């Protein structure tokens, strides 16, 4: 009955863990302690096979290690920065009145490393926006922002009041000072059945052809502007984009990243430094 | 049962697409590949008629190409600008304390081009207002705006505190700084059964008679004022009017606009420039 | 929350092999422990191999490690890496040892888990008073020691803490590494770790095992 699944869900008891059964001394030709790891299978041996156990009613649950629990938390994926101007000519320009950001999960290591535990992932994305407009003068002025999602092949804005900001077909969300953090869902939007966290392939046959997950699905661009025209007092605006996966599926688990990331969409790990090589978290003894 | 239509609606599976049936080699007097386009009908031939197909269970849906999906998105249709004054005499004047805008879908090309894919359209209009008041001095002051819809033949305001702003019969909406974006519906309001996107007709028989869709239905005027009397620090106010069609019907599809718009309610396309003629998006090779 | 794409139908979910529903499915897979982890070995496959050879003295130590899953050297194993995304852990651990000598080589080892309160065992005689396996190397090349969950509290911290520490594994010669002629008098063992059926992780956190600068 669905009420049992609801009660288990509010208790976080959906994913029950086996009890420890009582065991006793054994003298047998069966040797659970011995196996062949050469098979590629992990030994099935459990505590009851190798020590005399008591009965324990196991209270633990695995709900918080579900992939929905593990990946389904909001983390920063972009910091989008622009510095407004009192000059009408400069306020129209990129980096001043508006900024663009090529969408990916690749720029922030905390999120990137978690999703890269899997080869393929499929999820809907909850986006939440945290804007902080640092006043450089004696007043904030009126702060109204527009965030426009520009899909691949749609025209990207080149000016703060370009025709593209009309948003006649693109999704836009508006934010003004004192408004709660903007939030919207992007449904799972790949042309494939899952996102590639990794892709051992190319966009072509040639020396110049691109390699890796960047080939597989262009994710479009977030464009942000201040909607307000030029104002007396400048603002250093930073919009932080937070992403939570929802309705998550993940396939083909991978070793975690063991060394610093160097570049987006690349497994490259060799640093630029000539004295310092790539560093692991294995401590010597 | 209505629950099936609800489930299809939340999945976006209302408009199912045919499966590809399996096909085999054919040798016949029937020649699906041959037709007469002179008839004005498009050939009915499908992949199964011209290649050996496998069975494919087609997952695609047409929900997002519905006219409700295509036209039912908020796009900018006006930018209404006025610059407030600290001078009590100047703050009363048009362009300073208040502004008027003759209603149409004609001024912003992104919306205009989409609706002009059809000859006639019928919809209710959701209006949303995005106000950005750029502070020109050290403070915003108290910003309260009134947007008044003035139907055809109702008296248009000539002063910021004229009697017409009493709004005893006109619809007005008030906005103040920090208030969420104003929103209201205008029902389908033509004297005809649909809006004319195009009209091959005149308001009269004479050389001076107007031609085209401007004849067919005057849409009234949005009047915006700052309700606040004159204040110490000026504001460059821009109100952006966003329009979403709802409950949409559309008739008689048309070729899309292939060249820049030149004027409102006019199909004219010849630019003012003597070196540069009208430009298409057909690239040479 | 509202969808930004209001009529969009996502691409069909096709069957893909290897779906993961829970991180404990990954913790239940053996991964190699970098037991050797000396400065000479941490840039190489050699960190995963423990040296065995014919001893002159009886009952010598082979290796030792702390058992706490997110402590060094366990930290960079898959179970240690996943555990370091969580604040608490509980349940039993399986340590597996694969002998990589020749088929002509013979060996017994005593592998012991020592609970907290006494430090690391200083001899095989101290170690064998704890939970242990006497492993006979034979046609089956792998043996497993289960570190049973033996704790005062239902959970332990994954971060090192003297109140919460889990104790030690030590490995000792039981008998000796014995070989005939024309056989190397030395060999390697590979050490692995995975979760038993009772193993769980609780309170999710940022990992201490990965950082970003710039």
């Amino acid at each position: 009955n669905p009420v049992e699944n609801y009660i288990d869900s509010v208790l976080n008891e959906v994913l029950v863990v086996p009890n420890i059964q009582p065991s006793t001394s054994v003298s047998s030709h069966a040797a659970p302690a011995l196996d062949a790891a050469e098979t590629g299978h992990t030994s099935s041996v459990q505590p009851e096979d190798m020590i005399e156990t008591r009965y324990v009613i196991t209270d633990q649950t695995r709900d918080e290690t579900s992939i929905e629990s593990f990946l389904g938390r909001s983390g920063c994926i972009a910091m989008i920065e622009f510095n407004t101007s009192s000059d009408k000519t400069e306020h129209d320009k990129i980096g001043k009145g508006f900024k663009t950001w090529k969408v990916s999960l690749q720029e922030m290591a905390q999120i990137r490393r978690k999703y890269e535990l899997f080869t393929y992932t499929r999820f809907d994305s909850e986006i939440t926006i945290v804007t902080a407009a640092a006043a450089q003068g004696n007043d904030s002025g009126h702060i109204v922002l527009q965030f426009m999602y520009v899909p691949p092949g749609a025209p990207v804005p080149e000016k703060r009041d370009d025709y593209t900001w009309q948003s006649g077909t693109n999704a836009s969300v508006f934010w003004q000072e004192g408004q709660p953090y903007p939030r919207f869902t992007i449904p799972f939007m790949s042309i494939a059945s899952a996102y590639y966290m990794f892709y051992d392939g190319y966009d072509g046959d040639s020396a110049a052809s691109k390699y890796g997950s960047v080939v597989t699905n262009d994710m479009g661009t977030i464009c942000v502007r201040i909607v307000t025209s030029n104002q007396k007092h400048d603002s250093n605006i930073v919009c932080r984009i937070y992403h939570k996966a929802k309705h998550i599926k993940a396939w083909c688990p991978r070793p975690p990243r063991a060394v610093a990331y160097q570049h987006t969409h690349s497994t490259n790990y060799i640093p630029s430094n000539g004295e310092a090589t790539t560093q692991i978290k294995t401590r010597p003894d | 049962n209505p629950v099936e239509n609800y489930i299809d609606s939340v999945l976006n599976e209302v408009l199912v697409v045919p499966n590809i049936q399996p096909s085999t080699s054919v040798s016949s007097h029937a020649a699906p590949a041959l037709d007469a386009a002179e008839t004005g009908h498009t050939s009915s031939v499908q992949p199964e008629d011209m290649i050996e197909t496998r069975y494919v269970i087609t997952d695609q849906t047409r929900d997002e190409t519905s006219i409700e999906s295509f036209l039912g998105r908020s796009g900018c249709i006006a930018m209404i600008e006025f610059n407030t004054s600290s001078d009590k005499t100047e703050h009363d004047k048009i362009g300073k304390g208040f502004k008027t805008w003759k209603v149409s879908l004609q001024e912003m090309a992104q919306i205009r081009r989409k609706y002009e894919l059809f000859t006639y359209t019928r919809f209710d209009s959701e209006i949303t207002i995005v106000t950005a008041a750029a502070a020109q001095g050290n403070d915003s002051g108290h910003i309260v705006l009134q947007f008044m819809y003035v139907p055809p033949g109702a008296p248009v305001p000539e002063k910021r505190d004229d009697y017409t702003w009493q709004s005893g019969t006109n619809a007005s909406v008030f906005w103040q700084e920090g208030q969420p974006y104003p929103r209201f519906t205008i029902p389908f309001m033509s004297i005809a059964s649909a809006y004319y996107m195009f009209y091959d007709g005149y308001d009269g028989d004479s050389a001076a008679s107007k031609y085209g869709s401007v004849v067919t239905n005057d849409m009234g005027t949005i009047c915006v004022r700052i309700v606040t009397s004159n204040q110490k620090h000026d504001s460059n106010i821009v109100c952006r009017i966003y329009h979403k069609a709802k409950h949409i019907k559309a008739w008689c599809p048309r070729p899309p606009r292939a060249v820049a718009y030149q004027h409102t309610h006019s199909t004219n396309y010849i630019p003012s420039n003597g070196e540069a003629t009208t430009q298409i998006k057909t690239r040479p090779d | 929350s509202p969808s930004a794409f209001p009529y969009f139908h996502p691409t069909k979910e096709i069957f893909i092999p290897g779906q993961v529903r829970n991180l404990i499915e990954m913790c239940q897979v053996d991964t190699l422990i970098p037991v050797n982890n000396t400065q000479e070995n941490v840039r190489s496959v050699n960190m995963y191999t423990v040296d065995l050879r014919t001893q002159v003295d009886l009952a010598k130590e082979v290796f030792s490690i702390p058992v706490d899953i997110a402590s060094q050297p366990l930290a960079t194993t898959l179970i240690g890496e996943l555990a370091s995304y969580y604040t608490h852990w509980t349940g039993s651990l399986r340590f597996s040892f694969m002998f990589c000598g020749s088929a002509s080589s013979t060996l017994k080892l005593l592998i012991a888990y020592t609970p907290p309160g006494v430090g690391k065992p200083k001899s095989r005689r101290e170690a064998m008073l704890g939970t242990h396996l006497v492993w006979d190397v034979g046609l089956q090349s792998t043996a497993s020691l289960v570190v049973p969950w033996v704790s005062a509290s239902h959970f332990r911290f994954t971060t090192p803490d003297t109140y919460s520490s889990a104790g030690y594994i030590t490995c000792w010669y039981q008998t000796n590494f014995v070989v005939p002629d024309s056989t190397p008098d030395n060999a390697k063992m590979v050490c692995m770790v995975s979760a038993c059926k009772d193993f769980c992780l609780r309170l999710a956190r940022d990992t201490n095992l990965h950082t970003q600068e710039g």
Partner: peptide
């Protein structure tokens, strides 16, 4: 569980499996 929006993607976290 009440769903306020017309898209499946708009719903909160899915049930565990």
């Amino acid at each position: 569980n009440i769903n306020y929006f017309k898209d499946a993607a708009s719903s909160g976290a899915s049930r565990l499996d």
